[PDB]
Amino acid sequence: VNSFSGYLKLTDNVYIKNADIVEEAKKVKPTVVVNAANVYLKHGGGVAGALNKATNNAMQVESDDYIATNGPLKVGGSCVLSGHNLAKHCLHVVGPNVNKGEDIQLLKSAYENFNQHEVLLAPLLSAGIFGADPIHSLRVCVDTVRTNVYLAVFDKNLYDKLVSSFL
Numbered sequence: 001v002n003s004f005s006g007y008l009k010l011t012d013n014v015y016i017k018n019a020d021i022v023e024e025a026k027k028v029k030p031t032v033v034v035n036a037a038n039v040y041l042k043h044g045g046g047v048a049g050a051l052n053k054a055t056n057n058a059m060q061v062e063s064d065d066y067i068a069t070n071g072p073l074k075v076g077g078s079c080v081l082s083g084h085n086l087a088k089h090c091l092h093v094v095g096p097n098v099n100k101g102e103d104i105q106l107l108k109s110a111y112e113n114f115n116q117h118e119v120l121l122a123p124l125l126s127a128g129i130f131g132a133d134p135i136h137s138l139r140v141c142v143d144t145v146r147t148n149v150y151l152a153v154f155d156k157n158l159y160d161k162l163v164s165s166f167l
């Protein structure tokens with residue numbers, strides 16, 4: 001039993017809700033919130049900009065130190081950093097950004113990072129401003145993640161499209 005509420009159950013391990021991931025994290029305080037990161041951990045827009053804003057820029061300050069020490073992430077890769085006021089941990093995961101010409105096949109690799117955590121609150125990787133098809137992202141999620149994932153989503157109209165189209 002966990003404290004996630006109002007989710008539709010898609011499979012044994014994947015749940016989905018129309019929700020603002022910032023507000024969801026602030027309510028649930030999950031062990032892990034997933035950020036839709038880029039390799040530079042520059043949290044400018046989309047989910048990343050919103051999560052960082054909610055931390056009063058502390059996420060960005062921590063991220064800049066991480067990059068200065070370690071260099072950029074790989075597309076498809078991840079790192080675990082603080083969850084600040086939103087969660088215990090933030091798993092920063094880099095899905096391919098189609099608006100940069102990155103290989104959509106890397107989306108499966110990106111979702112594999114979720115399997116290192118028993119339970120996660122997450123967005124659909126590579127959706128929104130990363131330019132991939134969200135129906136595809138949900139399919140890859142369901143076919144790749146084996147741990148318990150709670151997907152938030154932001155856009156009420158896509159949420160309805162994702163449910164009604166879900167196979």
Ligand SMILES: OC[C@@H](Nc1ncnc2[nH]ccc12)c1ccco1
Pocket residue numbers: 019020021022036046047048050123124125126127128129134152153154155158
């Ligand atoms: O992963 C992309 C996804 N973005 C978010 N999902 C959940 N909560 C959010 N809060 C702020 C942004 C955001 C999206 C946007 C439009 C279509 O898909």
Ligand SMILES: [Cl-]
Pocket residue numbers: 045046047127128129130
């Ligand atoms: Cl987005």
